[PDB]
From a paper:
The [name]-like proteins were found to be composed of a conserved three domain architecture: a partially disordered N-terminal domain that is predicted to be proximal to the membrane and structurally homologous to an FN3-like bundle, a middle β-sandwich domain, and a C-terminal domain homologous to family 32 carbohydrate-binding modules, that bind to galactose. Using a series of domain truncations of [name], the predominant β-D-galactosidase activity is suggested to be localized to the C-terminal DUF5126 domain that would be most distal from the outer membrane.
Despite performing diffraction analyses on multiple crystals and no detectable protein degradation observed via SDS-PAGE, discontinuous electron density was characteristic across the majority of the N-terminal DUF4959 domain. Iterative rebuilding and refinement of this region suggested that it is composed mainly of β-strands, consistent with sequence-based homology modeling as an FN3-like bundle domain. This deficiency in electron density across the N-terminal region and sufficient size of the asymmetric unit to accommodate the domains was similar to results seen in the prototypical [name] and Ea domain of BT3700; thereby suggesting this region is consistently disordered and likely forms a discrete domain that would reside close to the membrane and have flexibility independent of the rest of the protein. Structures of the DUF5000 or Ec domains (BT2857C and BT3158E223–P440) were compared via the MatchMaker in Chimera using the Smith-Waterman algorithm, yielding a RMSD of 1.225 Å across C-alpha atoms, and a quality score of 0.768. In [name] an ethylene glycol and H265 are also structurally conserved. However, this is where the similarities at this region stop in that in [name] A304 is in a structurally equivalent position to D304, and none of the other residues between these proteins are conserved in this region suggesting sequence and structural divergence that could also reflect functional variance.
Numbering used by the authors: 128 to 165, 174 to 401
The structure:
């Protein structure tokens, strides 16, 4: 019966501010998960069941899970005591360029990719990592770096190159991208085999004004850092890629100022 396989194969792991519950359901049956603390009901029929409860402090808490079906069957309780994950800013000094053969180069104009992790950021900053021009027909493009440790990621903050603000939302500022990762050594050829997608991301321009016109709200917003959250169902990772799909001005050029990552080191 699906509800029995569900309770028998269940895994419950800590995640940021709660727990991640996963189980199997190869029949695509309709299961109801009731999750108790001393708080949520999931209604799902996917094959690879995975869902989160959040809102919890990072200390040990007792959790109870029961699975039921639309036929009035109900499982034994699964009990677990788990501590939710709590994020820290990962140590920037361990972040390094990890250049693979099919990556864009980010060492133009006197800087390197590792400039994105040197701490220098904000409206008046001249810091950046700066690529080379390419034809936008070549999007998507990507670059690769090493976090220098393995971590369960929560979120990251991204700053565009600024130089007083007029460079926001043009001149290499990225618009949509994906963040991919892996925990084991990449292949030197830059093959995408062995990489896992971790986040879909879109940098928002609050005003929605065309290229070359930035509002006061746009400039304040970008200078404060753009925040993105990662998927809960991701493995620990060490190596990271940004697969750039688009840029704000549509030109084939990537230029950014800073990237700070948050999560729990392994």
């Amino acid at each position: 019966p699906a509800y029995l396989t569900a309770i028998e194969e269940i895994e419950v792991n800590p995640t940021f501010g709660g727990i991640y519950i996963h189980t199997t359901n190869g029949g695509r049956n309709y299961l109801i998960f009731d999750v108790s603390t001393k708080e949520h009901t999931e209604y799902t029929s996917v094959k690879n069941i995975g869902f989160t409860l959040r809102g919890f402090s990072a200390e040990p808490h007792d959790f109870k899970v029961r699975v039921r079906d639309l036929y009035d069957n109900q499982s034994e309780e699964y009990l677990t005591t788990l501590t939710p994950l709590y994020e820290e800013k990962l140590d920037l000094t361990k972040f390094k360029t990890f250049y693979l053969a099919n990556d864009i180069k980010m060492d133009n104009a006197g800087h390197t990719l590792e400039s994105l992790f040197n701490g220098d950021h904000g409206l008046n900053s001249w810091n950046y990592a700066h690529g080379y021009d390419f034809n936008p027909s070549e999007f998507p493009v990507w670059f690769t770096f090493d976090m220098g440790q393995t971590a369960q990621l929560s979120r990251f903050t991204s700053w565009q190159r600024s130089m007083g603000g007029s460079y926001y939302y043009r001149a290499g500022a990225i618009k949509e991208w994906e963040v991919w990762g892996r925990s084991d050594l990449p292949s030197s050829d830059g093959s995408w085999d062995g990489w896992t997608k971790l986040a879909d991301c879109e940098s928002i321009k609050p005003s929605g004004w065309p290229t070359g016109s930035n509002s006061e709200e746009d400039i304040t917003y970008a200078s404060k850092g753009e925040e993105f959250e990662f998927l809960a169902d991701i493995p620990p990772v060490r190596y990271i890629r940004f697969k750039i799909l688009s840029t704000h001005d549509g030109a084939g050029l990537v230029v950014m100022q800073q990237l700070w990552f948050y999560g729990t080191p392994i």
